[PDB]
Amino acid sequence: TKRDHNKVYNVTLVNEERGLNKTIRVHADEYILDAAEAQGIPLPYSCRAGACVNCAGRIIKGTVDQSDHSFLKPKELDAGFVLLCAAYPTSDCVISTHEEDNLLNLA
């Protein structure tokens, strides 16, 4: 899938419990975690391969593409959950971080 590098989105990472609210620039062909790391923002992660839930976030605003290989169900995707290690922005976004436990609780 061709994703264009010079297309750049404003990705606001938010965590109310922790008082996090930081907006970074993320290229269309870059995973959100990898951008946050390049720009000095630590986010939770474990496998970094799309194959766990440790890096889970949840979309508040906008859109993302979750990589096909990611181990998220369509139901979970439809609920707004994202694995940031393996997701590309497709719009200016607001995403709440540290959403592992809420993903695990999704019925």
> Which amino acid is located at 83 in the chain?
L
**Backbone φ, ψ for residue 32 (5° rounding):** -55, -45
State in angstroms the smallest separation of the CB of 6 from ligand FES: 26
Interface mask (CB under 6 A) for ligand FES, residues 76-95, using x and -? -------x-xx---------
Q: What is the rounded CA–CA span in Å between residue 23 and residue 20? A: 10
Tokens in use for 104? 């695990």
How many other CB atoms are found less than 10 A from the CB of residue 95? Answer: 25
Residue list 2-61, contact with ligand FES (CB under 6 A): 45-52, 54-55
Residue numbers belonging to the annotated binding site: 46-48, 52, 55, 85
Binding site residues, ligand FES, CB under 6 A: 45-52, 54-55, 83, 85-86
